[PDB]
Amino acid sequence: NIESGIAHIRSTFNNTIVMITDTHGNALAWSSAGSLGFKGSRKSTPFAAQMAAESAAKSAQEHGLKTLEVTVKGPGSGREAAIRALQAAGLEVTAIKDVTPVPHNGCRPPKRRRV
RNA sequence: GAAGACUGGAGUGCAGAAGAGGAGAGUGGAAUUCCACGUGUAGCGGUGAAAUGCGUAGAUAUGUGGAGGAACACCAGUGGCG
Ligand SMILES: [Mg+2]
Ligand SMILES: [Mg+2]
Ligand SMILES: [Mg+2]
Ligand SMILES: [Mg+2]
Ligand SMILES: [Mg+2]
Ligand SMILES: [Mg+2]
Ligand SMILES: [Mg+2]
Ligand SMILES: [Mg+2]
Protein backbone atom coordinates (compact mmCIF):
# COMPACT_ATOMS: atom_id res chain seq x y z
CA ASN A 1 0.00 0.00 0.00
CA ILE A 2 3.11 2.20 0.25
CA GLU A 3 5.11 2.65 -2.95
CA SER A 4 6.04 5.22 -5.59
CA GLY A 5 3.75 6.53 -8.29
CA ILE A 6 3.15 8.93 -11.16
CA ALA A 7 0.64 11.73 -11.73
CA HIS A 8 -1.27 12.58 -14.91
CA ILE A 9 -2.32 16.19 -15.47
CA ARG A 10 -4.73 17.18 -18.26
CA SER A 11 -5.01 20.97 -18.43
CA THR A 12 -7.37 22.20 -21.15
CA PHE A 13 -9.22 25.44 -21.86
CA ASN A 14 -12.22 24.34 -19.79
CA ASN A 15 -11.16 22.06 -16.93
CA THR A 16 -8.19 20.39 -15.24
CA ILE A 17 -7.94 16.80 -13.99
CA VAL A 18 -5.24 15.31 -11.76
CA MET A 19 -4.90 11.52 -11.92
CA ILE A 20 -2.57 9.79 -9.46
CA THR A 21 -1.67 6.23 -10.39
CA ASP A 22 0.91 3.53 -9.76
CA THR A 23 3.93 2.86 -11.96
CA HIS A 24 1.88 0.63 -14.30
CA GLY A 25 -1.32 2.67 -14.54
CA ASN A 26 -3.52 1.46 -11.69
CA ALA A 27 -5.67 4.21 -10.20
CA LEU A 28 -5.15 5.50 -6.66
CA ALA A 29 -6.85 8.90 -6.36
CA TRP A 30 -8.12 11.70 -8.57
CA SER A 31 -9.68 15.14 -8.37
CA SER A 32 -10.79 17.86 -10.77
CA ALA A 33 -11.91 21.47 -10.67
CA GLY A 34 -15.46 20.22 -11.12
CA SER A 35 -15.25 18.03 -8.02
CA LEU A 36 -14.07 20.97 -5.88
CA GLY A 37 -17.35 22.83 -6.40
CA PHE A 38 -16.65 25.01 -9.44
CA LYS A 39 -19.37 25.15 -12.07
CA GLY A 40 -18.60 27.08 -15.24
CA SER A 41 -15.95 29.43 -16.58
CA ARG A 42 -14.18 29.35 -13.21
CA LYS A 43 -13.31 25.68 -13.76
CA SER A 44 -10.34 26.70 -15.92
CA THR A 45 -8.78 29.38 -13.71
CA PRO A 46 -5.33 28.61 -12.24
CA PHE A 47 -6.78 28.80 -8.73
CA ALA A 48 -9.14 25.92 -9.52
CA ALA A 49 -6.17 23.78 -10.57
CA GLN A 50 -4.24 24.56 -7.39
CA MET A 51 -7.06 23.19 -5.22
CA ALA A 52 -7.54 20.23 -7.57
CA ALA A 53 -3.89 19.19 -7.33
CA GLU A 54 -3.86 19.52 -3.53
CA SER A 55 -7.01 17.44 -3.03
CA ALA A 56 -5.52 14.60 -5.06
CA ALA A 57 -2.16 15.03 -3.34
CA LYS A 58 -3.61 14.74 0.17
CA SER A 59 -5.57 11.64 -0.82
CA ALA A 60 -2.34 10.25 -2.29
CA GLN A 61 -0.43 10.53 0.99
CA GLU A 62 -3.12 8.44 2.69
CA HIS A 63 -1.92 5.43 0.72
CA GLY A 64 1.62 6.70 1.21
CA LEU A 65 4.03 7.68 -1.54
CA LYS A 66 6.79 10.24 -1.99
CA THR A 67 8.29 10.22 -5.50
CA LEU A 68 6.30 11.26 -8.56
CA GLU A 69 6.74 11.57 -12.31
CA VAL A 70 4.44 14.19 -13.85
CA THR A 71 2.96 13.90 -17.34
CA VAL A 72 1.35 17.01 -18.84
CA LYS A 73 -1.26 17.18 -21.60
CA GLY A 74 -3.37 19.88 -23.16
CA PRO A 75 -2.92 23.60 -23.82
CA GLY A 76 -4.54 24.80 -20.60
CA SER A 77 -3.26 27.50 -18.28
CA GLY A 78 -3.14 25.29 -15.17
CA ARG A 79 0.13 23.51 -15.97
CA GLU A 80 2.28 25.68 -13.71
CA ALA A 81 -0.23 26.05 -10.88
CA ALA A 82 -0.94 22.32 -10.62
CA ILE A 83 2.66 21.08 -10.41
CA ARG A 84 3.83 23.45 -7.67
CA ALA A 85 0.84 22.41 -5.55
CA LEU A 86 2.19 18.85 -5.54
CA GLN A 87 5.55 20.09 -4.23
CA ALA A 88 3.94 22.26 -1.54
CA ALA A 89 2.09 19.17 -0.28
CA GLY A 90 5.42 17.61 0.71
CA LEU A 91 6.27 15.45 -2.31
CA GLU A 92 9.14 15.48 -4.80
CA VAL A 93 8.72 16.00 -8.54
CA THR A 94 11.33 13.83 -10.24
CA ALA A 95 10.51 14.75 -13.84
CA ILE A 96 8.12 16.72 -16.04
CA LYS A 97 6.78 15.18 -19.25
CA ASP A 98 4.73 16.61 -22.12
CA VAL A 99 2.44 14.06 -23.76
CA THR A 100 0.28 16.25 -25.99
CA PRO A 101 -0.60 13.95 -28.94
CA VAL A 102 0.70 15.64 -32.08
CA PRO A 103 -0.48 13.80 -35.22
CA HIS A 104 1.58 13.40 -38.38
CA ASN A 105 -1.08 15.17 -40.46
CA GLY A 106 -3.84 12.67 -39.77
CA CYS A 107 -7.55 13.36 -39.34
CA ARG A 108 -8.84 16.78 -40.35
CA PRO A 109 -10.02 19.13 -37.58
CA PRO A 110 -13.47 20.67 -37.14
CA LYS A 111 -14.08 23.88 -39.05
CA ARG A 112 -13.26 27.32 -37.71
CA ARG A 113 -15.67 29.30 -35.56
CA ARG A 114 -17.68 32.30 -36.76
CA VAL A 115 -17.62 30.96 -40.31
C1' G B 1 9.35 30.59 -109.52
C1' A B 2 13.77 27.20 -110.86
C1' A B 3 18.90 25.45 -110.23
C1' G B 4 23.03 25.31 -106.66
C1' A B 5 26.07 26.86 -101.96
C1' C B 6 26.50 28.04 -96.41
C1' U B 7 25.60 27.62 -90.91
C1' G B 8 24.07 32.30 -86.39
C1' G B 9 17.51 29.34 -86.74
C1' A B 10 15.68 24.30 -85.90
C1' G B 11 16.88 19.15 -84.86
C1' U B 12 20.24 14.54 -84.05
C1' G B 13 24.87 12.60 -81.91
C1' C B 14 28.48 12.52 -77.47
C1' A B 15 29.53 13.64 -71.78
C1' G B 16 27.11 15.20 -67.35
C1' A B 17 22.86 17.16 -63.75
C1' A B 18 18.56 18.29 -61.05
C1' G B 19 13.49 17.64 -60.06
C1' A B 20 6.42 16.69 -54.84
C1' G B 21 6.27 15.39 -63.77
C1' G B 22 2.77 10.85 -64.75
C1' A B 23 0.59 5.57 -64.33
C1' G B 24 0.80 0.63 -61.68
C1' A B 25 2.07 -2.75 -57.35
C1' G B 26 3.41 -3.16 -52.40
C1' U B 27 4.87 -1.44 -47.43
C1' G B 28 5.56 2.35 -42.58
C1' G B 29 4.86 5.46 -38.08
C1' A B 30 2.42 9.02 -35.20
C1' A B 31 -3.01 10.40 -34.22
C1' U B 32 -8.59 10.07 -34.03
C1' U B 33 -12.84 6.43 -33.47
C1' C B 34 -14.98 1.79 -32.03
C1' C B 35 -14.49 -3.03 -29.31
C1' A B 36 -12.66 -6.45 -24.92
C1' C B 37 -10.41 -6.64 -20.10
C1' G B 38 -7.66 -4.57 -15.30
C1' U B 39 -7.54 0.08 -11.68
C1' G B 40 -11.40 4.09 -9.80
C1' U B 41 -14.98 7.49 -8.14
C1' A B 42 -18.78 11.35 -9.40
C1' G B 43 -18.71 14.03 -12.56
C1' C B 44 -17.36 14.90 -17.97
C1' G B 45 -18.15 17.94 -22.13
C1' G B 46 -19.35 23.01 -23.77
C1' U B 47 -19.90 28.67 -23.85
C1' G B 48 -19.26 35.68 -23.84
C1' A B 49 -22.58 33.24 -20.09
C1' A B 50 -25.44 28.80 -20.41
C1' A B 51 -28.27 24.66 -21.80
C1' U B 52 -29.15 20.21 -24.99
C1' G B 53 -25.77 15.70 -24.59
C1' C B 54 -22.77 11.66 -22.11
C1' G B 55 -22.34 9.08 -16.75
C1' U B 56 -23.77 5.01 -10.70
C1' A B 57 -26.62 -0.19 -16.34
C1' G B 58 -19.92 3.32 -13.69
C1' A B 59 -18.53 7.67 -17.39
C1' U B 60 -14.18 11.21 -17.98
C1' A B 61 -9.09 9.50 -16.66
C1' U B 62 -5.62 5.41 -17.00
C1' G B 63 -2.70 0.50 -18.58
C1' U B 64 -2.91 -3.65 -22.12
C1' G B 65 -4.57 -5.78 -26.71
C1' G B 66 -7.64 -6.00 -31.47
C1' A B 67 -10.32 -3.83 -36.09
C1' G B 68 -10.71 -0.28 -39.77
C1' G B 69 -10.43 4.07 -42.81
C1' A B 70 -8.35 8.82 -44.38
C1' A B 71 -4.14 12.40 -44.56
C1' C B 72 1.32 12.17 -44.69
C1' A B 73 4.58 15.97 -38.26
C1' C B 74 10.22 17.86 -38.69
C1' C B 75 12.82 18.21 -43.73
C1' A B 76 9.94 22.98 -46.04
C1' G B 77 12.55 27.17 -48.72
C1' U B 78 8.69 34.84 -53.14
C1' G B 79 12.56 26.46 -53.06
C1' G B 80 11.47 22.53 -57.39
C1' C B 81 8.60 20.09 -61.58
C1' G B 82 4.57 20.46 -65.46
MG1 LIG C 1 -15.86 22.38 -31.03
MG1 LIG D 1 22.47 23.83 -81.77
MG1 LIG E 1 7.94 10.82 -59.44
MG1 LIG F 1 3.45 9.87 -59.37
MG1 LIG G 1 -1.51 3.29 -34.33
MG1 LIG H 1 -25.67 36.21 -18.39
MG1 LIG I 1 -10.98 3.71 -21.87
MG1 LIG J 1 7.41 25.68 -67.46
Nearest of A1, A3, A11 to residue A70 by alpha carbon: A11
Strand B–CB A46 distance below 7 A: no
Tell me how crowded residue A95 is: count the other CB atoms within 10 A of its CB. 10
CA–CA separation, A79 vs A52, rounded Å?
Answer: 12
Residue A19 in contact with residue A30, Cβ under 8 Å?
yes
Q: Is residue A70 classed as helix, strand or coil in its secondary structure?
A: strand
Structural biology method used: cryo-EM
* Smallest-distance ligand from the CA of A40: 6
> A104: CA distance to ligand 3 center in Å?
22
Q: How far is the CA of A36 from the C1' of B42 (A)?
A: 11
